[PDB]
Amino acid sequence: EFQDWPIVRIAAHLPDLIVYGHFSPERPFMDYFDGVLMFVDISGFTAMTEKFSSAMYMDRGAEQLVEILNYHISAIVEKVLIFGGDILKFAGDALLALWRVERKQLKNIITVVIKCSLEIHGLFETQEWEEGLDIRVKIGLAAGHISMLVFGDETHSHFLVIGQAVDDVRLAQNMAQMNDVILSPNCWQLCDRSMIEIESVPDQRAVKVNFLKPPPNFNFDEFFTKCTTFMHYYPSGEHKNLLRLACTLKPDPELEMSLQKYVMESILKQIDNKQLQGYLSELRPVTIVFVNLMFEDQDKAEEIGPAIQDAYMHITSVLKIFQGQINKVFMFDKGCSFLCVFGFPGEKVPDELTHALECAMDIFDFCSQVHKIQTVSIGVASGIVFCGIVGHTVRHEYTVIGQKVNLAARMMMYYPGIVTCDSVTYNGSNLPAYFFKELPKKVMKGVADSGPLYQYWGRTEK
Ligand SMILES: Cn1cc(Cc2cccs2)c(-c2cc(Cl)nc(N)n2)n1
Ligand SMILES: [Cl-]
Ligand SMILES: [Cl-]
């Protein structure tokens, strides 16, 4: 069976949530369901990202990083997919996975997901990044109600999952230390407590899994097989040994037209074999523009959707003018964030810095006027970042990785309500100093040395 069609290669960059969705053209589109989420990231990774920018790697740092990273990430992806999960998105060394099911099956599927988690940790026992640098992961799990949101224009689509279960899994994963599996309180409340031995987590209602102790007659393989009854797209029969049903997609112009809107043009070029398959693995100077839109705690997903759509329509028009791209969109704790980037796949202009600032101020001014958006915050950082397609052959995404990505991310959270930029952006800009304000230096998680940070005040006093 031939399976290397363009539609199949495109679907590798998307979850089943999208590939097998059958929703309208309206934007925003919103749908609601229940499921279990897994958030996982890798330990000792940014330690490696720094090593690979070193002259040691003789101009093949990006190639070596993507290789070792995909060696480990693809093993996680295989485990998730074998256990029936849907990988929603990748970001650097992290990924979010979904087991969507009806409420009645949540209990049994949580047990499936915990077993998956423990087998993921089993991969990284007796394993190291380097001589003397261990590789481990941290897993948070949550369960409950989940809302999906799709937004975009006629040519581009983006999607998110939203709600307390999403917020819950983010929080659970941040408590997790190396080798931990942390369950949200609602997950613990819904799970088969007859079978999961947990321990308290100080000052928190979330719990840590210690052991899966099933009854004496329990057989996991038979239990799992029964659970697959509720998995619409689990590969089966003649396709028993495929990792994804998406692998079997056949040409369908209408379907491909909708799927390609989720994928960046330079990726599509590679899918069409009009660009070398290694072009996108690179250590590249870029400017990161990390936009955060904050809503109110009581805001419902059905008011949030229209506001993200309106904001997105202006964000994409500004980025088009200033020649930037949306690399990722995320949401948790009532904040929807856009990871925008200037200067990757051939999108290199000399005034990159002035255009990133002016573009940021434009996005700020417009989004501050959108009805339900309570606060806008934008962090701008410039420097060398890793770019590449991360994941497994059958499920992967283009992603950017680096200190400057993390810095822009922390700037928009620690300096809310304004536009901030780093020292590289400030000095390199073709703008005078009174357009800026030098800021207080705040200690920020995961950023050892900020360097001087500035607010982009604007051209006027007012
Ligand atoms: C790798 N990655 C990281 C994130 C942030 C989150 C991590 C835990 C909850 S959210 C996402 C994501 C994906 C989708 Cl589809 N929706 C939303 N809200 N976040 N993916
Ligand atoms: Cl098809
Ligand atoms: Cl870096």
Side-chain angles (χ1 to χ4, degrees), residues 141-143 163-173 183-187 333:
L141 309 179
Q164 191 65 52
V166 176
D167 299 343
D168 283 348
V169 80
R170 213 283 308 179
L171 281 154
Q173 201 271 344
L183 313 182
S184 75
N186 196 46
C187 188
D333 292 335

Side-chain angles (χ1 to χ4, degrees), residues 44-53 57 65 129-130 133 386:
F45 172 60
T46 39
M48 290 307 306
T49 305
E50 292 284 42
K51 292 216 160 210
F52 283 112
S53 38
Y57 286 93
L65 175 63
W129 285 103
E130 261 166 8
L133 165 54
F386 290 95

